[PDB]
Design a binder for this molecule. Structure first.
Ligand SMILES: [Cl-]
Ligand SMILES: [Cl-]
Ligand SMILES: [K+]
Ligand SMILES: [Mg+2]
Ligand SMILES: [Mg+2]
Ligand SMILES: [Mg+2]
Ligand SMILES: [Mg+2]
Ligand SMILES: [Mg+2]
Ligand SMILES: [Mg+2]
Ligand SMILES: [Mg+2]
Ligand SMILES: [Mg+2]
Ligand SMILES: [Mg+2]
Ligand code: NA
Ligand code: NA
Ligand code: NA
Ligand code: NA
Ligand code: NA
Ligand code: NA
Ligand code: NA
Ligand code: NA
Ligand code: NA
Ligand code: NA
Ligand SMILES: [Sr+2]
Ligand SMILES: [Sr+2]
Ligand SMILES: [Sr+2]
Ligand SMILES: [Sr+2]
Ligand SMILES: [Sr+2]
Ligand SMILES: [Sr+2]
Lengths: 119, 65, 194, 46, 81
RNA sequence: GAUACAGGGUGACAACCCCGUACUGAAGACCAGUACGCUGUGCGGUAGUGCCAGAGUAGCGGGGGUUGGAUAUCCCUCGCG
RNA sequence: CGCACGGAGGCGAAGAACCACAGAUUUCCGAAUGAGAAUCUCUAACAAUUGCUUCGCGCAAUGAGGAACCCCGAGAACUGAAACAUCUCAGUAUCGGGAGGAACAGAAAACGCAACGUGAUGUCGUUAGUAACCGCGAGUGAACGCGAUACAGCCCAAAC
């Protein structure tokens, strides 16, 4: 909630998680904050996801400023387990990432643009 | 003298439970004559009666019930 | 590349600048209202916890603690103690706040043993520390190649005997050579001149 | 003073401790009670 | 397990209740109730108990005064034992 | 007599009256779930690469205490870092 | 058929007594734990605090004892200084917490006989009443090394 500068709508969030659900059934994803951070650093991240219910916040804090100095687009998800089920996990993820989408690139391009319009 | 270890293991869990009473009554009927201070005492039997009731209770635990 | 953990470590190098500054201002408002020892599901400093030995396993507990600030809550002399032995507010104790914190936490959990602890900040009236605790009887730890040492009979009540990492540091056992003649093997064996 | 059940069980035993060493112990050891208590000169518990 | 009836109290006053008032006196276990002493006396002597009066003697034992019914005679019970 | 002359007992000073004592042999515990052996694993080297290596810490200042620790002991405490 | 040589009676060749090992029984109070209580009473009990959890006290943990030893805390005064205050007595006494058959320590951000040297830790001898401290007074007092005892060396955090 401190690392959040903008509220992402439910309509856009549905469109975001649907894109993540097909990203595991085509290409590859990154499940877990440790693997997502290295994605942004290695550049291999197309679109990165971040959960808003992470307690402690420290595990995520860096993602908004890191993704900004690396140009990699980011998006906020309200719940942790919603992002968990979307990555294809039984548990939950604090932050997820999409490394080369695959049959979603026509929507990821727009999601990334709908966030820039929302600042 | 009358009741040995072997003679107790030759019984059934119902013969022991009945021999228990047949001795527990014999004890109370020996303890009553000791309450009046009567002379027809048999000091050895009153001692062996305790030992016997103890043996049957011991074998009872050993044989299941 | 860097670990995501290294971004929490680098943040805690300055717990009063930026994102953590605004965080600790908020958290402490709820912490001041929270008890003495509160069991918390997840630690506040992931890197530090894991570095100390914390795993995301069954029977690995973490608990925050808050101890009063300052020196000693030392009174005055009833019976005849000289001028030198008359200091009330100017004297402190021989166990640092982190050790009291670890002890208060091990008594709140009479079956779990202290692994290690760390600081999670402080305000004007109190100091906070988070203590990692382990269950010696849980089979999840009994067969752990990285934590099964804590299940030994001789490790029972290890905080109270000063066998903690925080303990050995206060006992003056960090240095291996000079100025550690009176501290090693134990203070008591050296007549208490540590 | 009102005594309880246990207090009674105790004062009861203390009275049996006041019995002499039987005539036969003298004849068996071939020749003294040390817990000899009087109701006036001595003091019990409670 | 403890037994209720220990031994009969056979004193001169225990006769003054046996002859005159049809009462049998026993020195029972102190953890026994008037209702437990009652059932116990019946199941050992084939009698019918109407009243039981207890007292905690100065011997630590409990003295039980058991009154029988008219159909049973106290003098006749004390004979066999 | 003696690989047994340590000791005690026994109606008085006993190697040969009695228990024992020497020699020989047996059991348990402890050493020790150790040593030894075995099973699996895999030790090591060359060049390239600023990928990684524990913070209120190292260190500084005020106050206390302690030490043989003298500027050069270890510790607690407040501030700073 | 105890101490303990009575009287009476009993047991023992169905091998008793006695002893070694294993087991049965083992009242109530007692950490004392369903609740209360001067060892008793009252209408189903891991009371209390925790862990795991089928979230049910389901499976577990702590509690208290032990001659001393051990470890972490708290910490006197008499006394000495020919008084006394810093100092001494002394981290002694006593107190609070906790572990085990031993405890603690321990594989160098070491030592610094400065070296082309030693190579985890205790302990014993020595170093030495030395260095050091101190109304520089009374007194306080190591260590590196050396010789010995015994030897043992490893595991994470992160990177990937
Ligand atoms: Cl502990
Ligand atoms: Cl050397
Ligand atoms: K003084
Ligand atoms: Mg020692
Ligand atoms: Mg009398
Ligand atoms: Mg009454
Ligand atoms: Mg009770
Ligand atoms: Mg003087
Ligand atoms: Mg001094
Ligand atoms: Mg002078
Ligand atoms: Mg000194
Ligand atoms: Mg040195
Ligand atoms: Na009697
Ligand atoms: Na504990
Ligand atoms: Na009296
Ligand atoms: Na010191
Ligand atoms: Na300081
Ligand atoms: Na026993
Ligand atoms: Na439960
Ligand atoms: Na003087
Ligand atoms: Na004087
Ligand atoms: Na001086
Ligand atoms: Sr979760
Ligand atoms: Sr009097
Ligand atoms: Sr009487
Ligand atoms: Sr390091
Ligand atoms: Sr304990
Ligand atoms: Sr060695």
């Amino acid at each position: 909630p401190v690392y959040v500068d903008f509220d992402v709508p439910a309509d856009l969030e549905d469109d975001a998680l649907e894109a993540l659900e097909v990203a595991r059934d085509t290409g590859a994803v990154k499940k877990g904050t440790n693997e997502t951070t290295k994605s942004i650093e290695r550049g291999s991240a197309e679109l990165v996801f971040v959960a808003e219910d992470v307690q402690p916040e420290e595990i995520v804090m860096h993602i908004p400023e890191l993704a900004d100095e690396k140009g990699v687009p980011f998006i906020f998800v309200e719940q942790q387990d919603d992002l968990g089920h979307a990555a294809g996990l039984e548990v939950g993820s604090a932050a997820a990432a999409v490394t080369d989408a695959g049959e979603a690139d026509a929507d990821v391009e727009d999601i990334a643009d709908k966030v820039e319009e929302l600042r | 003298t009358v009741l040995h270890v072997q003679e107790i293991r030759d019984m059934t869990p119902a013969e022991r439970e009945a021999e228990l009473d047949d001795l527990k009554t014999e004890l109370l009927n020996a303890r009553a004559v000791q309450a009046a201070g009567g002379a027809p005492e048999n000091p050895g039997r009153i001692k062996e009666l305790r030992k016997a009731i103890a043996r049957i209770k011991t074998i009872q635990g050993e044989e299941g019930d | 590349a860097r670990s995501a953990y290294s971004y929490i470590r680098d943040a805690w190098k300055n717990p009063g600048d930026g994102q953590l500054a605004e965080l600790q201002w908020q958290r402490q408002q709820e912490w001041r209202n929270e008890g003495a020892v509160e069991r918390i599901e997840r630690p506040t400093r992931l890197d530090k916890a894991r570095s100390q030995g914390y795993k995301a396993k069954q029977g690995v507990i973490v608990a925050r603690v808050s101890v009063r600030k300052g020196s000693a809550r030392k009174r005055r002399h009833k019976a005849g103690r000289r001028s030198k032995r008359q200091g009330v507010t100017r004297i402190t104790r021989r166990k640092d706040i982190q050790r009291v914190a670890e002890e208060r936490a091990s008594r709140t959990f009479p079956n779990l043993r202290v692994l290690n602890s760390y600081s999670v900040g402080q305000d004007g009236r109190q100091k906070w520390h988070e203590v990692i605790l382990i269950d010696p009887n849980h089979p999840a730890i009994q067969n752990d190649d990285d934590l099964s040492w804590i299940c030994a009979d001789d490790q029972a009540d290890r905080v109270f005997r000063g066998l903690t990492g925080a303990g050995r540091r206060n006992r003056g056992l960090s240095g291996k050579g000079k100025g550690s003649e009176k501290t090693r093997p134990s203070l008591r064996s050296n007549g208490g001149k540590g | 003073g009102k005594k309880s059940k246990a207090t009674k069980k105790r004062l009861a035993k203390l009275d049996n401790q006041n019995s002499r060493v039987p005539a036969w112990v003298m004849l068996k050891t071939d020749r003294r009670n040390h817990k000899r208590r009087h109701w006036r000169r001595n003091d019990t518990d409670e | 397990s403890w037994d209720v009836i220990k031994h009969p109290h056979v004193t001169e006053k225990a006769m003054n209740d046996m002859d005159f008032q049809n009462k049998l006196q026993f020195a029972v276990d102190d953890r026994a109730s008037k209702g437990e002493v009652a059932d116990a006396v019946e199941e050992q002597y084939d009698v019918t108990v109407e009243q039981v009066n207890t007292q905690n003697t100065m011997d630590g034992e409990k003295k039980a005064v058991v009154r029988l019914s008219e159909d049973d005679d106290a003098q006749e019970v004390a004979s066999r034992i």
